[PDB]
Design a protein around this ligand. Structure first.
Ligand code: MG
Ligand code: MG
Ligand code: MG
Ligand code: MG
Ligand code: MG
Ligand code: MG
Ligand code: MG
Ligand code: MG
Ligand code: MG
Ligand code: MG
Ligand code: MG
Ligand code: MG
Ligand code: MG
Lengths: 186, 149, 82, 83, 216, 129
RNA sequence: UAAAGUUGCUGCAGUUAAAAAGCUCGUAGUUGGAUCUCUCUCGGCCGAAGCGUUUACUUUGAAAAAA
């Protein structure tokens, strides 16, 4: 179930693959996880003692994963000790073309292979159970930036407790500070 | 404002912020593409196809569902007209005005409107030549216009 | 005048403006589920429809287009979506 | 304001409007220097302390001194938050 | 009122406001008098928010009390409905009343007999006392006004959103302002109702005077 | 049609500053506009601003402090060498104790003094004081 | 030559003092909305070779008669 691009697995990836095998055997979602696979996994520390698991899955299987996302997250959170498990796709980053750039520019860089596009996709997939309805960027007096993300009100109760782990994951991956809010209505 | 009128209207469409397909929509990409193919085979321009899909099948935006525009889908399938629909409509309107004008020699307003329409046709033809959609010898001539459309 | 929060307009302020002049554009239209009394099929209809919508099962005229919105045939019920 | 030695060199330091931060000149006769009394939270009598506001004549001619004074009083806590 | 419980509006004050009709405005609304309005009902009449009126009245009282010399406050009424109220306010507080016509140049022409240098100005109507308002801009004079739904706010610093048409409403507003000023000064107390009733500030309407003269 | 976005944004900011407004709404947004606003904010002329992100070109809401006398743009964008900077400073700035000319150089978008420190020229965008 | 911001690129005017074509179309010209964070090989880390999609710009350096 683990097929890393570098072909080198680790202990956490092995354990999560074993958990996925257990879910294949002991649950009703056999075919889905049999067809699907993951690329990598990682763990980070956020919220002053809380731990978050990040599951890097391939892009051509992200849509199929989203079908079971909620149930799979529940099963993983029940199998593991109290953590926060999030599934994120595997986006490649291509460097910006330059005058000194070599034959790596033999093909035009797709717009999807872009830092901004990849960051937007990561943010969108990070909070998948709730849709994004608005985005604001505040530039502080010292020059720093803060990103405010508005989430859907109809799914507030589902992900209201995971906001801090989202702000930790995005800071660990993208490197930016982000906050989440729930506007009243439009 | 308008290219050839003093009017400065603001009426247009405003797409929603969200790009995600609504939950109630049961149609898949392949089913939408099959509907598009059937409508195109029936002889409908992409604009009419989009209007029908919006009005009847609850398809707000095909590009949101199938990830592609109507014209590109038709070109990939091969069911695409030789010349673009907007240029076709402009040439058809010019032909209609010219047919009216030959029986009414004293209608100077028709002559003015025909001049405006032909100017727009020349603009669009030059733009399409720039993008190589038309061969760099395609010309709009009044006599040929009837056979063109 | 000289003191107004542009970042946080009230909900009624944003429904009174033009759809393009809002902070973020949002259409005033919607999709609806309609049901005719004769036949049980539920049809999805755009509020500002421009074509006559016929019931597939029984060929009943569900709506007639007008300048602004499409008016439903008498005896037909509708409910907004989401 | 001051030279390289740090000594201040000016006739006087003019005061600025509290609403718009504009400088109130010596010939601006439409400017107002208003004082609002402070009351004791227990009894409600005059404490003896007050808060000072200054409004230039340009704002007053615009008819915007009422809103500016109201906002200044709200910021200082004189006016109730649920105004 | 800085959310203090002692300064909150009581039920009897609400009853007095409802009886006097101070919450009833005009059919026209000024674009700078819209934050004190509540809602426009049928027949075009606008309703004023009484809580904001109380807040503005308390702010005006705080502004008045801050002046050390009571004689430096001038209270001006041009219409007949406000003259008696202004006179009673001046008698009870110690301000300087100007009832009737205001002489142009009172604040600017320094060789006139009636030349004065007030530190604060209180008016009954911006649209009727516009002449004293305009001369305030010449001598750095803050102004307090009893405005309505349709009222210009040029040179007005503290606007009290009341009904300035009816005699009862004007008298009640002046009486309440005087009461609040005296209570803040530390002259009368907030524990018991004031001895004087608000009917002493109302317009006589010599028709009413003739009716009462022949009562006995 | 609209041909310069920085010119429109600066004109809107200046007009709102003259009227005593507290906040300004400028659309459409642009990264050149963001750089210009950052340069102005580093010197304390405007204050914090927020970028509203709709899916088309964005908008900006800028807070005002009342310290801005004049902000303007120079069109066309003239090439400025390091030895011709003093002439532009004399022509455009009010005094030699305050005011800044904004340049876009190969190092980035900065003021004239920072370009003197880094010993580089570029193209003039605008000025503010 | 300056004065002449009375030839105005910096930097002028065109309602009534001199002044905007009767109106529209249109080629050339001018101007033009957002968005994208060095390289293998061959030779002694460097040497050769391809660089750069190319420019415009800016900062260097070289060559630039004296008077
Ligand atoms: Mg045109
Ligand atoms: Mg239209
Ligand atoms: Mg000369
Ligand atoms: Mg000269
Ligand atoms: Mg001459
Ligand atoms: Mg000059
Ligand atoms: Mg001249
Ligand atoms: Mg003439
Ligand atoms: Mg003309
Ligand atoms: Mg041309
Ligand atoms: Mg551009
Ligand atoms: Mg030489
Ligand atoms: Mg020489």
């Amino acid at each position: 179930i683990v097929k890393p691009n570098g072909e080198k697995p680790d202990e956490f990836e092995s354990g999560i693959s074993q958990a996925l095998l257990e879910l294949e055997m002991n649950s009703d979602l056999k075919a889905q996880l049999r067809e699907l696979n993951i690329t990598a996994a990682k763990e980070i520390e956020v919220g002053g003692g809380r731990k978050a698991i990040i599951i890097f899955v391939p892009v051509p299987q992200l849509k199929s994963f989203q079908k079971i996302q909620v149930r799979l997250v529940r099963e993983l959170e029940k199998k593991f000790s109290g953590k926060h498990v999030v599934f994120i796709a595997q986006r490649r980053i291509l460097p910006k073309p330059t005058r000194k750039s070599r034959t790596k520019n033999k093909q035009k860089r797709p717009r999807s292979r872009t830092l901004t596009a990849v960051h937007d996709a990561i943010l969108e997939d990070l909070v998948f159970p709730s849709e994004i309805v608005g985005k604001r960027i505040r530039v502080k007096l010292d020059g720093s930036r803060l990103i405010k993300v508005h989430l859907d009100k109809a799914q507030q109760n589902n992900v209201e407790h995971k906001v801090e782990t989202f702000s930790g994951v995005y800071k660990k991956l993208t490197g930016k500070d982000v906050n989440f809010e729930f506007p009243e209505f439009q | 404002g308008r290219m050839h009128a003093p009017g400065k209207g603001l009426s247009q469409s405003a797409l929603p912020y969200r790009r995600s397909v609504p939950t109630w929509l049961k149609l898949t990409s392949d089913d939408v593409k099959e509907q598009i193919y059937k409508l195109a085979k029936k002889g409908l321009t992409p604009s009419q196809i989009g209007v029908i899909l919006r009005d009847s099948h609850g398809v707000a935006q095909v590009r949101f569902v199938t990830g592609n525009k109507i014209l590109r889908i038709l070109k990939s399938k091969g069911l695409a007209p030789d010349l673009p629909e907007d240029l076709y409509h402009l040439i058809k309107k010019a032909v209609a005005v010219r047919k009216h004008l030959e029986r009414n020699r004293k209608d100077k307003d028709a002559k003015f409107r025909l001049i405006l329409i032909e100017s727009r046709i020349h603009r669009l033809a030059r733009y399409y030549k720039t993008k190589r959609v038309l061969p760099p010898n395609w010309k709009y001539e009044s006599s040929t216009a009837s056979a063109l459309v | 005048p000289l003191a107004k929060d542009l970042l946080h307009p009230s909900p009624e302020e944003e429904k009174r403006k033009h759809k393009k002049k809002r902070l973020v554009q949002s259409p005033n239209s919607y999709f609806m589920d309609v049901k005719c009394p004769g036949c049980y099929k539920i049809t999805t209809v755009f509020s500002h429809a421009q074509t006559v919508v016929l019931c597939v099962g029984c060929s009943t005229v569900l709506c007639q287009p007008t300048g602004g919105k499409a008016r439903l045939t008498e005896g037909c019920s509708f409910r907004r979506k989401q | 304001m001051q030279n390289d030695a740090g000594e201040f060199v000016d006739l006087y330091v003019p005061r600025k409007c509290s609403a718009s931060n504009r400088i109130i000149g010596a010939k601006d006769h439409a400017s107002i220097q208003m004082n609002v009394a402070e009351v004791d939270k227990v009894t409600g009598r005059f404490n003896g302390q007050f808060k000072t506001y200054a409004i230039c004549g340009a704002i007053r001619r615009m008819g915007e001194s009422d809103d500016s004074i109201l906002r200044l009083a709200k910021a200082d806590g004189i006016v109730s938050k649920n105004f | 009122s800085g959310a203090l419980d002692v300064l909150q509006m009581k039920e009897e004050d609400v009853l007095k406001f409802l009886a006097a009709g101070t919450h009833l405005g005009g059919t026209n609304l000024d674009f700078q008098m819209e934050q004190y309005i509540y809602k426009r009902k049928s027949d075009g009449i606008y309703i004023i928010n009484l809580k904001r009126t109380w807040e503005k009245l308390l702010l005006a009282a705080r502004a008045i009390v801050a002046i050390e010399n009571p004689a430096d406050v001038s209270v001006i009424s041009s219409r007949n409905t406000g003259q008696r109220a202004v006179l009673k306010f001046a008698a009870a507080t110690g301000a300087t009343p100007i009832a009737g016509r205001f002489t142009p140049g009172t604040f600017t022409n320094q060789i006139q007999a009636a030349f004065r240098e007030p530190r604060l100005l209180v008016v009954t109507d911006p649209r009727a006392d516009h002449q004293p308002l305009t001369e305030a801009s010449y001598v750095n004079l803050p102004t307090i006004a009893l405005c309505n739904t349709d009222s210009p706010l040029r040179y007005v610093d503290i606007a009290i959103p009341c009904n300035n048409k009816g005699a009862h409403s004007v008298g009640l507003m002046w009486w309440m302002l005087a009461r609040e000023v005296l209570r803040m000064r530390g002259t009368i107390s907030r524990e018991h109702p004031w001895e004087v009733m608000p009917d002493l500030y109302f317009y006589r309407d010599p028709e009413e005077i003739e009716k009462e003269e022949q009562a006995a | 049609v609209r041909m310069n976005v920085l010119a429109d944004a600066l004109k809107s900011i200046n007009n709102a500053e003259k009227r005593g407004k507290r906040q300004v709404l400028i659309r459409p947004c642009s990264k050149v506009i963001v750089r210009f606003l950052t340069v102005m904010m580093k010197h304390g002329y405007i204050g914090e601003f927020e970028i509203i992100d709709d899916h088309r070109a964005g908008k900006i809401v800028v807070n005002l402090t009342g310290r801005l006398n004049k902000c303007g743009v120079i069109s066309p964008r003239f090439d400025v060498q390091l030895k011709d900077l003093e002439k532009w400073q004399n022509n455009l700035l009010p005094s030699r104790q305050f005011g800044f000319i904004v340049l876009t150089t190969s190092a980035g978008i900065m003021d004239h003094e920072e370009a003197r420190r880094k010993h580089t020229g570029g193209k003039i965008l605008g000025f503010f004081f």
